[PDB]
Design a protein around this ligand. Structure first.
Ligand SMILES: [Zn+2]
Ligand SMILES: [Zn+2]
Lengths: 486, 697, 488, 375
């Protein structure tokens, strides 16, 4: 029934969290000992451009043995987990500073910033920061100055603690004074229903994986949109690291500056990293680089053939079907895994009779299907036909041919040609997906989708074949019918 | 229009001047031809074209070669490697370096000139430099040479002055099923004459982190990589390196373990099997105390480094002697100046000063750096690209034995089969004239061969030609027949050929070559279709027009009902032979847990590119969600986005009795949905901001 | 083939121009003088410092450049920093020179500098990668695009545009064109645009402006706003001057309270500074600005305009001819935009742009600090601050449109080598037909970037010693006849 | 038929070239558009269409069977004509020769080259625009998912005018003729032109499925659709395929922009009060340039419909005659968050207060991928 959005309760997330909890408030960056520990938990640091030669590890990289999986490290107090599947969880937490009522959900700040913040006078800082300064004369717009005069005449008390304690009154006034001049009814309903989850006591710092620091021979490289997150976290740390303890007013002013920095980060990160063409959503949530795939140029199968069969080159067959061949080699020839892997990689660039026999046995064992199911993709993908399901029925015995031979009866549907067209092949791992991808079998684009009771023009024969037929059918090889009857 | 009148000459056409029939081809196809000649690698069977516009002579003047820039005097000749019979001897010397002096100069500038065995301005295509024997054997100290004297050049530059840009092929225009979608049907013997050569370099680094393995040695000899003149071993491995670990010495350092390459845990560099190594360069860091290389693993490394150090030491010695004699009067070229800088970077530094930290574009060198250059010859077979000189691009789609290709009644065997119908749809009719006129020209030369008593196909010998030239009446008659053909097909050529000083020599050349070469300038004043009509209605120069016989795709010997004409076409190979194919069953991931991109260091670690292919974009998932369905579409994505699901797929293949008939790969009860890393990252970021996406109740 | 046939074919075939075929970048960068043995690139460096000597304080001289020995070349690129000597072994085609300066007869510290070397076929290797350096076809003197006259100097680039203003003459409303240009850059950092007549009034007096150039005795024909200026009843230039004067006055009327103050000089400068930018700072600031403006016409730019036929010796003479002789280019241009005949193949102006930038900023530092005693230590620090080891070559493989990666699968030098031509529009990172393409370009060679055939160079083109494209007479008639039919 | 291969050579060219009537259509011609394109080209077309001429010729036999085309052949055997410059401007003088004879003078050769320059254009921008247009229309159309076979037995019909331009587009549509019986358009009912008929329409369906319709209301074109296919995607693909083919091969780019502005409401679809009044306007607009079936037209318009704008109910209306129209941007952000997360500016829906209020919403195929496969 579709998807909608909810509001999470941060302190409930805090309560249900498992493991020792690290708070960024308890860190003085000035002490060089504490800075190193802070960077241990915040950044995921890479000391060079060298490949990580480890599969599992603890937090502090003291244990890199896969047989110790699940054992808790004694130095970092972290269980040994498998990398590439490590759970994504907050790296730290932010407590409520001294003489501060509570924190603010960053979602509420982002919504308010859309309305309250203007080019000449923002209203959120005025209501929350006592150190914000303004010039009424400098305002050069009638609408904003009218709003400013109305707010000043109202006589509110500047301060974060006052703002949190009296929020219904301030929020109501913002609606009445036309400060929030859009979606007044919807915004009121949102606040009136989620007011119990808008002022948390703890806020989670994003995961260690989000912030990646790469140190090279030419300096350390960082992602610019991460900047606000670093600044927000350090700001809360400096509250208890100040040499002179901060007065309650100064504590609130610094707390609000940190919260305003968190709101800036999430909005900018969503705008710049989640929501764009090479973003998280459009590149990885709705797309992927798949395993067990191949890519090569194409040629034609012009000899008598079945329209839904495919021929792959020798080199593609060896690398694509590596684990299929390894299974056969171990069983038939009593090879070890090391020997089988060595045997397969050795014969990628040369013909081998034993490998060729195994290829046919793999194809013949795909019964009752003609061969191994696969899907062939042509880009750009617009119509049904640019994605088709074929069956691998033959691995070419000539190693100099590095093309995938395609049936000549299925070239019009994807508008495929032989001039530098690299197509993408995807191997189906099991029978369940082979049945599923039957929906894009070549026969599924035969019937026209433009005109009823008609066959699409994709089925028409190619030029060279038609010329041969008309050279035969329309030859004047017989006398006229009148002469035939004499 | 006054058919038979042309105004444009060579100076206004540009690269189009290489086409004698530019006027009969559409502008779109003419542009394609000019692009094509810039993408054509040199082949082994290249030869001069049958029809010449004269522009080939100019293009043969400007090629990348080795020259003497100015009138100079040879001072020193250096060889990189001492080819001899010594204990440490190399089979061949790759590079010869010449130091000369411009003695016709006020300042007597001293320069350097290198003479390698090849050149390569392309990523994966080059050519061999053929040394000029007369000049090469002369070269010695205290010898003077003239400006613009060629020492070595490519084999394309013929001695006559012509240029080899392609190979002439017998072509029949037929509608065989193998010609679908601009496909070519190629004779196997023809493809042996269109073989390109590729030159490439492999680089390895060893030292504090890893050591070389014994890939080319035996139980008594340690030889990490092949020598100069050797060939790459059949599996294609050039060299491999293993990590340093002392605690595993009884396992990883046995003589057997040093000979066995582990694909999973070692790192190798793989090239073309059977390729011949032609050059080696080694850089060593000598100020290491102690060297991390184990003893007995550097005999080959030291042998090449010692000879290389001697070569650079002599270069630096020569300059210092020159500087002593010509204080403030020594002028050197910019090339020589950079060469001396390289020598100082190579030789060790004096102990009084700090050592050098060598880098290659922000990459720090280890103790050893080895560079190996090898050359391989490619046999075109399938997916290779070809085109004529009229824009008719095509792809080789079928290869047949020589005995199966079409053959006419006179014994001519076709090299290619091309669909003729596409000519009318693209309006490149220069195809027709070269084919049609070449057929008439070829038949005329063969007819004179038979009339003289020679074999019409075999190349005649000197004894046969001498006897043929004895008869004068036939020689005079043969010359007139050639002139009569020239009058029809080439008017400008005909006028020049009227006053041939030695007509017998022209006839002798034609019989030996088996083809009369035709000069066809772009501004030739000839009516083309009037010439075609003359040839058809002629009793002398009418080309043979009959049936052909070939073996069809069913293995049956058949003969065509229609008359088929066989003629020549100038063909050239095009780049992108499809050698960059990719295929991988499992790929290496990132710390995040997703497939990673491939850098240059990992490009050659496998015989073929093992890269994950983005076969499911956002557009494809839009199409799959509608046809296949959202259900199965999510399964396909999760098998990669979730690394644990991918691990389940591999185990299913390995444990299955029939790996190609697995019912279900991922057991969704043991590994349920919800483990995809991109989705988990999406949920985590939104949760921190304070929101979550949920199903509507 | 028959040996006699080849000779007859060769006899009947014209030859290409060897300068273009062998590569013109090599001919323009590495050719050495027989007398002195110094190449073109080093001579170009000397000429750059000759035109910039007018901004040098007394006693400061440029002594030339010298070639460095390979030993010093090796020592400079392996200089020790942080107890480490980094050596880059990736092959490059570079050589080193020293820049010599002296102060009151005392030689200062030489400044080493790296320069690129080119080989046959416009080939150069930079940091292990091969490149091709192609010439750029550029306009000589000035360029016209759309109501704009672009004039490039060695230190500046100026564009001249047009605006219309209304003035009342003898009780009759009239419209005249006002030529303006933006010469100060903080004006861009900022309504009236800087008028050329306003600059004339800032330099000369209004009466002096009219009498010296227009030979008009302006008083106080009667011209008024829409204050009186009176001219005898017996020009277009004077009309433009009047229009610009009223264009300035109308939007700043408070400043001209008394008519006599019009003939002053400080008031015009105050108005100009308020346009660009406190009165005290403004008055002093422009007095330096007009000082630099009066010295902006370098010798090299003068010779370029001389070829076109402009004949200007001072920057004020150039402004006069823009308002008098080149004014019609703003609305009715008589120069064909699509032509390729009156252009020049230029190499060094685009190759040495970064070094030219350093030279200009060095001269500007002296101008900004006039009337100051210079110490040897201060000069040495200034020279080190501007002329560094890799100043000239630091962006060759970044944003230079005439340098491109090399990919040649065969041995030919012409096909994608010395026949590549770069248009002026793409020099730093189409048009209708013209018969000149058949003579200068290759109208059938149509790459994707330049489908009109102007991206390739005809190998038979006739080129002068300085790179000027000349016309071939033997094809003059046929080219001319086609051009008429193209526009008919 | 391996013995009956067709061949080409200069012998075939001579046969067509030497015909007396072909040789007369190249002499004594007025160098004008009328003289060349109509008189000279007319004579050659007459010869090529005579069944008694060129018997057994490879070139002509292919022309009769559709292998060749007269446009290319006329420019080869008759006068080439008037090529245009890169700015689509024509030249005063023509090319007085065909390709087979050749063009060997500087003026005519150069202007002919401009055709090759015109061939290569900024297709990179065209690809970018077409891909964006296709993606945008497909995402919204996918909200109409299923097509059920059968008949829903509705008394709601639709009154549509029938014209000479849209008669072909009505193929397969069931219309109620006299005596209250259903018949479907076969495409040759010329007597119906200029009248108004009562059609079974998508907007009148009463199928229980909240995002589906029955076969009868869709028309007989639904027989060709494979089982289980998203019917909305089919309509968008059909429209996108024809526009993309025309754009890449009045500019069709302006046509694509015109369709986009009309459907997405920025003479906008939101102006009209009922879908019945809007379909003939869109059908005439669509069928004037491309050929789009009425069934596809109804689906695209139906996707832009909402139940109640006042109460912010953006679900599809059922039946479709009780709904209103809405802009594209508001619909893509307020129907389902799964579809919203796949188009543009994904941060904006997260800030919208309406996204957090419990509402009845339709679903999108991308909903599953947002949750990673969970149900
Ligand atoms: Zn640990
Ligand atoms: Zn219905």
């Amino acid at each position: 029934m579709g998807l909608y959005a909810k509001v999470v309760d941060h302190n409930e997330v805090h309560d249900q969290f498992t493991g020792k909890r690290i708070y960024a408030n308890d860190y003085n960056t000035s002490n060089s000992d504490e800075k190193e520990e802070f960077d241990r938990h915040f950044y995921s640091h890479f000391q060079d451009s060298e490949a990580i030669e480890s599969s599992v590890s603890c937090d502090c990289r003291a244990i890199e043995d896969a047989h110790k999986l699940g054992v808790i490290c004694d130095i970092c107090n972290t269980p040994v987990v498998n990398t590439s599947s490590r759970p994504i969880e907050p790296s730290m937490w932010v407590r409520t500073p001294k003489h501060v009522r509570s924190l603010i959900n960053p979602r509420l700040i982002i919504m308010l910033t859309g309305y309250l913040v203007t080019k000449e006078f923002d209203f959120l800082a005025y209501l929350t920061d006592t150190s914000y300064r303004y010039d009424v004369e400098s305002i050069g717009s009638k609408e904003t100055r009218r709003k400013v005069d109305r707010l000043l005449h109202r006589g509110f008390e500047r301060g974060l603690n006052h703002f949190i304690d009296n929020f219904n009154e301030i929020f109501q006034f913002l609606l009445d004074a036309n400060i929030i001049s859009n979606n007044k009814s919807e915004f009121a309903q949102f606040v009136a229903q989620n007011k119990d989850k808008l002022f948390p006591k703890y806020l989670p710092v994003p995961s260690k994986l989000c912030f990646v620091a790469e140190s090279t021979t030419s300096g350390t490289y960082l992602d610019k949109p991460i900047e606000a997150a670093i600044d927000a976290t350090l700001t809360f740390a400096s509250i208890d690291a100040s040499s002179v303890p901060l007065s309650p007013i100064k504590a609130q002013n610094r707390t609000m500056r940190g919260l305003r920095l968190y709101g800036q980060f999430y909005e900018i990160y969503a705008k710049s990293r989640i929501a764009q063409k090479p973003g998280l959503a459009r590149r990885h949530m709705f797309g992927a680089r798949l395993n067990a795939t191949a890519r090569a140029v194409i040629t034609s199968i012009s000899d008598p053939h079945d329209y839904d069969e495919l021929h792959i080159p020798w080199g593609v067959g060896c690398q694509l079907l590596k684990y299929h061949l390894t299974n056969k080699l171990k069983a038939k020839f009593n090879m070890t895994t090391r020997e089988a892997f060595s045997f397969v990689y050795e014969n990628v660039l040369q013909y081998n009779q034993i490998i060729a026999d195994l290829f046919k046995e793999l194809i013949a064992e795909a019964a009752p299907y003609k061969g191994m199911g696969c899907t062939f993709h042509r880009n750009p993908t617009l119509q049904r036909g640019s994605t088709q399901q074929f069956f691998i029925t033959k691995v070419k015995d000539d190693i100099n041919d590095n093309s995938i031979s395609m049936s000549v009866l299925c070239l019009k549907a994807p508008n495929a040609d032989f001039d530098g067209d690299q197509l993408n092949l995807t191997l189906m791992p099991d029978v369940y997906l082979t049945k599923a991808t039957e929906r894009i079998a070549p026969h599924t684009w035969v019937l026209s989708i433009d005109e009823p009771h008609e066959i699409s023009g994709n089925l028409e024969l190619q030029g060279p074949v038609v010329e041969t037929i008309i050279n035969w059918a329309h030859e004047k090889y017989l006398p006229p019918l009148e002469e035939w009857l004499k | 229009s006054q058919l038979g009148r042309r105004e444009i000459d060579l100076t206004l056409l540009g690269h189009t001047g290489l086409d004698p029939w530019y006027g009969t081809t559409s502008s779109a196809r003419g542009a394609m031809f000019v692009t094509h000649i810039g993408q054509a690698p040199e082949v082994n069977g290249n030869e001069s074209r049958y029809f010449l516009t004269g522009a080939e002579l100019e293009y043969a003047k400007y090629t990348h070669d080795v020259r003497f820039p100015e009138d100079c005097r040879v001072l020193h000749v250096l060889r990189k490697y001492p080819t001899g019979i010594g204990k440490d001897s190399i089979r061949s010397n790759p590079v010869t370096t010449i130091i000369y002096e411009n003695y016709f100069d006020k300042y007597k500038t001293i320069g350097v000139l290198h003479v390698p065995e090849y050149m390569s301005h392309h990523q994966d295509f080059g050519y061999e430099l053929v040394k000029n024997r007369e000049v090469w054997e002369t070269i010695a100290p205290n010898e003077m040479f003239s400006k613009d004297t060629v020492i070595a050049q490519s084999g394309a530059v013929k001695k006559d002055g012509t240029l080899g840009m392609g190979v002439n092929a017998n072509v029949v225009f037929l509608s065989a099923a193998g010609t679908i979608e601009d496909g070519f049907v190629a004779n196997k013997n023809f493809l042996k004459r269109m073989m390109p050569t590729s030159y490439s370099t492999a680089v390895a680094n060893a030292g504090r982190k890893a050591f070389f393995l014994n890939m080319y040695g035996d139980d008594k000899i340690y030889k990490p990589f092949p020598d100069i003149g050797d060939v790459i071993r059949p599996d294609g491995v050039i060299f491999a390196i293993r990590d340093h670990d002392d605690d595993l010495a009884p396992a990883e350092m046995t003589p057997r373990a040093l000979r066995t390459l582990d694909r999973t845990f070692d790192r190798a560099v793989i090239g073309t099997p059977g390729a011949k190594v032609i050059d080696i360069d080694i850089w060593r860091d000598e100020r290491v105390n102690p060297s991390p290389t184990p003893t007995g693993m550097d005999a080959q490394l030291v042998k090449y480094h010692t000879h290389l150090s001697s070569y650079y030491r002599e270069l630096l010695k020569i300059y210092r002697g020159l500087l002593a004699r010509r204080k403030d009067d020594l002028h050197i070229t910019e090339e020589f100046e950079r060469l001396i800088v390289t020598a100082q970077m190579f030789l060790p530094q004096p102990d009084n000063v700090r050592k050098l930290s060598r880098f290659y574009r922000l990459d720090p060198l280890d103790e050893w750096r080895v560079e190996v250059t090898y050359k391989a010859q490619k046999m075109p077979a399938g997916a290779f690209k070809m085109t004529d000189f009229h824009g008719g691009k095509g792809v080789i789609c079928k290869v047949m034995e020589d005995e199966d290709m079409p053959i006419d009644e006179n014994g001519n065997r076709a090299d290619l089969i091309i669909f003729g119908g596409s000519t009318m749809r693209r309006s490149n009719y220069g195809r027709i004239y070269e084919h049609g006129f070449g057929a008439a020209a070829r038949d005329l030369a063969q007819r004179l061969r038979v009339e003289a008593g020679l074999d019409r196909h075999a190349k005649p010998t000197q004894q046969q030609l001498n006897s043929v030239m004895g008869n004068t009446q036939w020689v005079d008659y043969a010359f007139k027949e050639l002139l009569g053909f020239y009058e029809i097909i080439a008017p400008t050529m005909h006028s020049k050929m009227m006053e041939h000083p030695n007509p017998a020599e022209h006839v002798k050349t034609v019989l030996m070559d088996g083809f009369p070469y035709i000069y066809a300038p772009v501004d030739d004043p000839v009516d083309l279709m009037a010439a075609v009509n003359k040839l058809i209605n002629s009793d002398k120069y009418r080309p043979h027009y009959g049936k052909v016989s070939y073996r069809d795709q069913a293995g049956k010997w058949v003969t065509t009902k229609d008359n088929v004409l066989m003629g020549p076409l100038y063909m050239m190979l095009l780049e992108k032979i499809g050698e960059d194919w990719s295929a991988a069953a499992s790929v290496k991931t990132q710390p995040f847990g997703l497939p990673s991109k491939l850098n240059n260091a990992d490009r050659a670690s496998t015989p073929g590119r093992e890269t994950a292919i983005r076969s499911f974009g956002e557009s494809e998932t839009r199409s799959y969600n509608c046809t296949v369905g959202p259900g199965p579409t999510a399964e396909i994505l999760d098998q990669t986005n979730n690394p644990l699901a991918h691990a389940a797929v591999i185990e299913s293949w390995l444990t299955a009795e029939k790996p190609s008939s697995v019912p279900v790969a991922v057991d969704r009860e043991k590994i349920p949905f919800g483990g995809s890393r991109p989705v988990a990252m999406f949920d985590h970021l939104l949760e921190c901001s304070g929101i979550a996406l949920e199903y509507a109740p | 083939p028959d040996p006699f046939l080849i000779e007859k074919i060769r006899e009947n075939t014209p030859c290409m121009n060897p300068t273009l075929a062998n590569g013109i970048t090599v001919e323009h960068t590495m050719t050495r003088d027989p007398n002195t043995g110094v190449n073109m690139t080093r001579r170009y460096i000397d000429s750059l410092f000759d035109i910039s000597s007018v901004l040098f304080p007394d006693g400061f001289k440029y002594e030339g450049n010298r070639a460095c020995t390979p030993l010093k070349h090796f020592e400079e690129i392996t200089r020790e920093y942080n107890a480490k000597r980094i050596a880059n072994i990736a092959p490059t085609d570079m050589y080193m020179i020293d820049l010599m300066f002296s102060y009151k007869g005392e030689m200062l510290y030489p400044r080493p500098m790296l320069l690129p070397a080119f080989k046959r076929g416009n080939m150069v290797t930079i940091n292990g990668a091969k490149y091709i350096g192609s010439p750029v076809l550029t306009d000589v003197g000035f360029s016209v695009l759309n109501d704009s006259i672009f004039i490039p100097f060695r230190r500046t680039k100026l564009t001249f545009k047009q605006t219309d203003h209304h003035y009342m003459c003898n009780g009759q409303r009239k419209i005249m064109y006002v030529i303006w240009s933006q010469i100060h850059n903080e004006m861009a950092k900022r309504h009236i645009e800087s008028c050329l007549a306003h600059y004339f009034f800032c330099q000369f007096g209004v009466t002096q402006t009219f009498k010296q150039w227009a030979n008009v005795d302006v008083k106080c024909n009667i011209y008024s706003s829409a204050m009186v200026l009176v001219i005898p009843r017996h020009s277009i230039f004077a009309t433009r001057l009047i229009a610009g004067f009223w264009y300035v006055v109308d939007a700043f009327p408070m400043r001209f309270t008394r008519p006599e103050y019009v003939d002053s000089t400080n008031l015009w400068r105050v108005i100009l500074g308020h346009m660009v930018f406190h009165q005290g700072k403004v008055e002093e600031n422009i007095d330096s600005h007009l000082h630099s403006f009066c010295n902006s016409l370098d010798e090299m730019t003068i010779e370029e305009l001389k070829t076109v036929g402009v004949n200007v010796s001072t920057i004020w003479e150039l402004l006069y001819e823009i308002m008098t002789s080149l004014a019609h280019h703003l609305y009715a241009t008589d120069i064909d935009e699509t032509s390729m005949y009156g252009k020049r193949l230029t190499v060094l102006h685009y190759l040495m742009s970064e070094f030219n930038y350093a030279v200009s900023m060095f001269g500007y530092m002296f101008q900004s600090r006039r009337d100051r005693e210079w110490t040897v230590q201060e000069l040495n620090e200034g020279l080190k601050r501007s002329f560094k080891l890799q100043t000239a070559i630091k962006r060759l493989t970044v944003d230079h449109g005439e340098l491109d990666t090399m990919s040649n699968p065969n041995s030919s030098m012409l096909i994608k080598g010395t026949s590549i031509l770069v248009t002026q529009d793409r020099a730093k990172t189409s048009r209708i037909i013209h018969a000149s393409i058949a003579e200068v370009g290759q109208y059938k060679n149509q790459p994707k970037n330049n489908p009109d055939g102007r991206g390739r160079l005809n190998m038979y083109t006739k080129v002068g010693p300085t790179g000027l494209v000349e016309r071939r007479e033997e094809v003059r008639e046929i080219i001319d006849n086609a051009q008429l039919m193209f526009r008919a | 038929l391996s013995e009956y291969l067709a061949t080409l050579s200069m012998f075939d060219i001579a046969e067509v070239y030497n015909h007396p009537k072909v040789r007369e259509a190249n002499h004594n011609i007025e160098p004008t558009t009328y003289g060349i394109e109509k008189i000279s080209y007319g004579k050659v077309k007459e010869v090529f269409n005579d069944p008694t001429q060129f018997i057994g010729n490879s070139i002509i036999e292919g022309l009769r069977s559709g292998t060749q085309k007269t446009e290319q052949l006329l420019q080869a055997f008759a006068w080439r004509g008037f090529p245009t410059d890169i700015n689509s401007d024509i030249f005063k003088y023509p090319v007085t020769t065909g390709y087979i004879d050749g063009i060997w003078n500087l003026y005519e050769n150069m202007i002919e080259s401009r055709s090759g320059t015109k061939a290569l254009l900024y297709n990179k921008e065209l690809l970018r625009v077409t891909e964006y247009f296709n993606r945008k229309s497909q995402l919204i159309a996918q909200y109409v998912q299923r097509l059920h076979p059968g008949d829903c037995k509705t008394t709601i019909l639709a009154e549509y005018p029938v014209t000479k331009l849209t008669l072909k587009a009505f193929k397969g549509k069931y219309y109620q003729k006299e005596d209250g019986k259903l018949d479907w358009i076969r495409g040759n009912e010329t007597h119906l032109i200029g009248t108004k008929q009562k059609f079974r329409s998508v907007f009148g369906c009463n199928h229980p499925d909240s995002q589906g319709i029955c076969m009868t209301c869709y028309g007989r074109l639904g027989i060709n659709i494979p089982k289980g296919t998203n019917i909305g995607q089919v309509a968008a693909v059909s429209m996108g395929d024809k526009i993309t083919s025309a754009v890449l091969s009045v500019n069709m780019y302006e046509v694509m922009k015109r369709f986009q502005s009309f459907l997405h409401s920025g003479t906008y679809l939101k102006n009209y009060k009922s879908p019945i009044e809007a379909l003939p306007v869109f059908a005439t607009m669509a069928n004037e340039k491309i050929s789009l079936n009425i069934s596809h037209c109804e689906i695209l318009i139906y996707a832009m419909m909402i139940r109640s704008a006042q109460y912010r109910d953006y679900r599809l209306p059922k039946p479709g005659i009780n709904g209103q129209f809405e802009k594209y941007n508001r619909l893509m952000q307020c129907r389902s968050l799964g579809g919203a997360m796949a188009f543009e500016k994904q941060h904006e829906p997260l800030n919208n207060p309406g996204s957090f209020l419990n509402k009845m919403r339709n679903d999108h195929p991308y909903d599953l991928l947002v949750k990673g496969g969970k149900l």
